[PDB]
Design a protein around this ligand. Structure first.
Ligand SMILES: [Mg+2]
Lengths: 141, 100, 50, 452, 47, 50
């Protein structure tokens, strides 16, 4: 019933705080490295529901996000779900044709133009795919 | 399950017409598969398109304009549509729409 | 000596000018008899000529 | 050794009924309280001004970062923060040719050049307002570089004549990189503060378009808050002293009201920064009726504050018009009395919120200082405290100090942590500055959109 | 109070003054934006 | 790294085991991306062996 977000540590941070707190506000239990190594691997396998990966020039070559992506792919090949990995495009200097493998075949969400539209379409996708939720508790965020 | 009505278009433009057509057709009671409304996020880009064209399309509508008829994706879906039409032996399977 | 009284400098150099530290004062008697001191910086050119 | 008490900082109420302290941090997580569906803009300037404005309005649609995101938080973007649509396509344009500007500014005079420019801009705005179909909520006056080198107050007053919201934006603010000048360096570089400019402009535009950014929650129910500021209209014939006010009372439940109380009441003398009995009676009656029309009841206490003392000739009138058991308290807030407190160990100044109580009727509030949340100073050098004195009436000093912080926490014109004095006085001063340059306006509007 | 009695012109002037005073005061002494104002005339005012 | 920096002519085998395998599909996607950047129509030469 969790949601996993992978990102670069020094860069692509502010977006992660914003997104994590917004999703916690509406009642989506998210597991991000900001809020809190074997624990990560156990949460990607036995706990998470949707694995979100942030794509950026700073990322896309970092070791930790790549390892988390590999574990997520292995879990996806077993859970029988084609929407386990949902890339989020949060850059404007990296082309859509330079994305690394294992995610290059998946359609992104394009947070590039505006973050509110990305959040709205993300929530619409979650409602369409029946991601579990609790009533909005805005105090916790 | 050949009930869907596939609609193809161009990526940057020729989208408003497709949205209008899909909404009107769904209002009329048909079943329409489109890249704009449908094709949920996080899904493989081309495998689902191929599966829908092969195993689910009753009819295949392609919009034709100066924008289209030269883009790679439109031609790819057209080739798959021609293959499926030849297999199905249905003369009226591809219905062009000349918006321009 | 060396422009410093008790290791605290009260006059230096700003490019071609010299800067000095200046204070004012004023009496007051309501809370307690005090002498309210306010700080200023006074600039000269040669060091002795304002 | 004397002990300084501490006043806990107030909290402002954002959307969803949640509290915070920094507006920049509370708007991003929760957002504004009310729903306005969009801001339809209007531009009155040169075509290059239109290009600059559209470029800036497209730039602020996406996140902008500062150099230090702890002292100066980043900007998520207009639609992400406010939930509105302020686009660069639904834009109404009224052009001013360069020929007209050159003709009206070539030689003329000073009071003639300013008057001519104000007439040109106001003619465009008012004509577009009265005979046109498209709706414009906020008018953005993009002023070229040669015009701003008196005009702003005249523009705002002559538009106040017809109650049209307006916002003046010089081209140097929106295109600071282009106006290089000097020897190759910008006159005012915004490179490290580009996330604060967007915050401030966006919040001003949202407020001037009928929006409610935040609201106060920790204030005593029932009591009013009037702030009197005197301005010298003596620049013209028949020297006089005009007085202006501003009221901050609370609604009948879960609400905040922050308007002006104007109709400036003059004073024929020269240095008499005071009020006549009849004018004082009129002011108090107007304020009391304004409160009673909203809350359907009379106040419980009136909290009058100003930068000057209150003589016994006006307080008697105030008590003569006050009904039932409505108490009154007079407070005087001086600003630059010379008391500076240093820190024995450290290069950082005294924390904000420290209060030194001299007597039961006097205190030393510290509004500027070091904010732990921002990890930086709200001022420069060693901050100066304000002086609070309970001139007339009976009240507790600590409650007065808490109310002063609460008033300090209510600045809508800029998006900052806090101010160094209550915002009612500042807004009253702005209103007085606007009304001085006018010519005998009768029954002016009481809304800050038209003034601020 | 306003509707009853008075001249046919005076009562109309009084009702118009009341409604338009409310509208104008709300227009200039309020912060909330109103794009269009709706006047729901009661039944007795019409006659 | 090899598909984007060192290759000169992609070749893909076509069979009933292929054209549906994940690894072949990913390599095909990367090859198509490199195809547009290089502006060479004859970059992918399929091999039909089944
Ligand atoms: Mg302003």
């Amino acid at each position: 019933n969790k949601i996993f977000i992978s990102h670069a540590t020094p860069e692509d941070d502010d977006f992660t705080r914003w997104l994590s707190l917004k999703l916690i506000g509406l009642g989506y239990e998210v597991w991000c490295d900001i809020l809190f190594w074997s624990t990560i691997e156990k949460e990607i396998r036995e706990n998470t529901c949707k694995f979100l990966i942030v794509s950026s020039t700073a990322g896309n070559k970092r070791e930790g996000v790549l390892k988390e992506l590999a574990v997520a792919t292995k879990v996806k090949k077993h859970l029988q779900d084609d929407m386990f990995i949902i890339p989020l495009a949060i850059d404007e200097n990296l082309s859509y044709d330079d994305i690394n493998i294992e995610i290059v075949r998946l359609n992104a969400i394009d947070f590039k133009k505006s973050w509110a539209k990305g959040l709205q379409d993300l929530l619409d996708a979650f409602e369409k795919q029946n991601v579990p939720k609790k009533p909005p508790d805005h105090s916790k965020s | 399950m050949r009930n869907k009505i596939f609609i193809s278009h161009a990526t940057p433009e020729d989208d408003d017409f497709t949205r209008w057509l899909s909404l009107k057709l769904i209002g009329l009671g048909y079943e329409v598969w489109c890249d704009i409304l449908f094709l949920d996020k996080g899904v493989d880009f081309w495998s689902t398109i191929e599966k829908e064209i092969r195993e689910n399309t009753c009819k295949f509508l392609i919009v034709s304009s100066t924008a289209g008829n030269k883009r790679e994706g439109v031609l790819k879906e057209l080739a798959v549509a021609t293959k499926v039409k030849k297999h199905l032996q249905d003369d009226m399977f591809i219905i062009p729409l000349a918006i321009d | 000596e060396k422009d410093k009284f008790e290791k605290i400098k009260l006059v230096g150099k700003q490019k071609n000018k010299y800067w000095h530290f200046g204070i004012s004062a004023a009496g007051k008697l309501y809370p307690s008899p005090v002498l309210m001191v306010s700080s200023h910086i006074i600039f000269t050119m040669d060091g002795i000529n304002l | 050794m004397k002990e300084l008490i501490y006043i806990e900082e107030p909290s402002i109420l954002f959307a969803h009924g949640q509290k915070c302290t920094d507006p920049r941090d509370g708007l991003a997580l929760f957002g504004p309280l009310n729903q306005i569906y969009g801001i339809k803009s209007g531009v009155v300037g040169t075509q290059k001004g239109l290009q600059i404005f559209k470029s800036y309005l497209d730039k602020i649609q996406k996140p902008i970062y500062n150099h230090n995101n702890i002292t100066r938080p980043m900007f998520p973007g207009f639609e992400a923060v406010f939930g509105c649509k302020w686009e660069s396509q639904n834009i109404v344009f009224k052009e001013i040719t360069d020929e007209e500007i050159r003709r009206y500014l070539f030689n003329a005079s000073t009071h003639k050049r300013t008057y001519d420019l104000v007439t040109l801009f106001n003619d465009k705005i008012i004509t577009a307002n009265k005979n046109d179909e498209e709706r414009v909520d906020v008018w953005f006056v993009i002023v070229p570089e040669e015009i701003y080198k008196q005009f702003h107050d005249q523009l705002k007053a002559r538009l106040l004549e017809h109650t049209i919201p307006t916002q003046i934006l010089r081209e140097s603010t929106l295109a600071w990189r282009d106006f290089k000048n000097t020897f190759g360096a910008p006159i005012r570089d915004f490179s490290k503060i580009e996330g604060h400019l967007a915050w401030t402009i966006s919040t001003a535009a949202y407020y001037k378009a009928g929006g409610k950014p935040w609201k106060l929650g920790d204030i005593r129910p029932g009591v009013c808050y009037l702030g009197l500021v005197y301005k010298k209209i003596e620049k013209s014939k028949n020297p006089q002293n005009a007085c202006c006010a501003a009221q901050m009372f609370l609604d009948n439940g879960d609400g905040t009201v922050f308007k002006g109380e104007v109709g400036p009441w003059y004073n024929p003398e020269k240095g008499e920064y005071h009020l006549k009995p009849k004018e004082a009676k009129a002011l108090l009656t107007q304020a009391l009726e304004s409160y009673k029309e909203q809350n359907k009841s009379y106040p419980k206490e009136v909290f009058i504050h100003a930068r000057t003392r209150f003589n016994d000739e006006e307080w008697n009138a105030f008590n003569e018009v006050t009904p039932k058991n409505t108490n009154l308290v007079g407070v005087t807030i001086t600003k630059s009395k010379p008391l500076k407190l240093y820190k024995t160990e450290g290069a950082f100044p005294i924390m904000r919120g420290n209060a030194y109580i001299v007597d039961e009727k006097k205190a030393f509030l510290w509004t500027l200082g070091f904010v732990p949340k921002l990890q930086s100073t709200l001022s420069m050098e060693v901050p100066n405290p304000i002086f609070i004195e309970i001139n007339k009436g009976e009240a507790e000093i600590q409650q007065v100090l808490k109310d002063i912080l609460a008033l300090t926490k209510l600045n809508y014109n800029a998006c900052i942590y806090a101010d160094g004095e209550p915002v009612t006085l500042r807004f009253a001063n702005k209103i007085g500055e606007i009304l001085t340059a006018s010519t005998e306006i009768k029954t002016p509007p009481l809304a800050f959109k038209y003034y601020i």
